[PDB]
């Protein structure tokens with residue numbers, strides 16, 4: 275999955291194979307290689323340092339210095355350390371009879387695409403989604419979600435220019451009651467950078483609509499920095515979970531591996547292609563396996 279990191283890790287481990295017992299010196303050399311692989315993958319410096327302290331402690335706790343096949347102990351502890359950095363176990367959204375979600379984040383992060391993906395995901399699970407196109411600034415934004423809605427077979431309500439947050443609410447709540455739409459997915463405005471006025475508008479919108487979940491959508495190819503906006507969003511709006519997009523173009527994985535530490539939020543979904551089908555519920559253990567070469 276994260277080819278640069280994946281190859282560096284597997285290499286550092288494969289270097290130990292078939293050489294018998296290792297000394298403490300050998301073990302420290304491998305931990306350094308692991309640390310550099312994480313630093314070059316743009317992993318948060320604190321996450322990387324904790325990762326390797328955890329690999330050390332765990333591997334010594336399994337008597338790696340007495341193992342005749344220490345590569346296998348290192349492989350297992352690296353797996354476990356990847357899993358826990360990614361969040362340990364899956365924490366997926368629990369839906370109720372009526373649900374309203376926001377997708378928030380910077381322009382270009384994958385919000386509109388992710389909205390349509392979620393509508394498709396849940397449509398197939400028996401839900402009746404409604405996309406709400408509430409981004410009025412982005413050129414053709416409403417037409418874009420309108421078209422994606424046609425593609426996935428899901429209705430799209432478009433907010434009008436200047437519409438107030440209470441008018442949006444009434445119109446969305448009306449459309450969802452009349453048509454029995456039990457998952458409302460709201461695609462929101464966003465710029466290339468944190469914009470304070472616009473954050474104010476978003477906060478006001480959140481207060482009025484009262485979403486059950488607020489998904490912060492993050493382009494995984496910007497690495498660590500993708501995560502710099504997380505506190506800003508959370509302090510103003512109240513983020514409940516993350517979507518990490520464009521993992522299919524991400525060679526490093528720094529944002530994914532750093533997300534839990536930096537943001538304290540669970541990863542809900544991964545975006546793995548530009549198609550509406552390109553959406554995976556997020557399981558730390560699957561990605562952990564994938565990074566070390568599984569599948």
Ligand SMILES: Nc1nc2c(ncn2[C@@H]2O[C@H](COP(=O)(O)OP(=O)(O)O)[C@@H](O)[C@H]2O)c(=O)[nH]1
Nearest residue numbers: 381382383384385386387519520545546547548
């Ligand atoms: N390859 C890939 N492309 C994606 C993914 N998610 C979104 N995109 C693409 O990223 C770009 C931005 O998508 P968009 O939904 O408009 O982002 P937005 O400005 O935050 O709404 C578009 O070219 C999408 O096709 C993903 O998981 N993988």
Ligand SMILES: [Cl-]
Nearest residue numbers: 302303306307
């Ligand atoms: Cl060295």
Ligand SMILES: [Mg+2]
Nearest residue numbers: 385386412415
């Ligand atoms: Mg958009």
Ligand SMILES: [Mg+2]
Nearest residue numbers: 485486487514
């Ligand atoms: Mg909730």
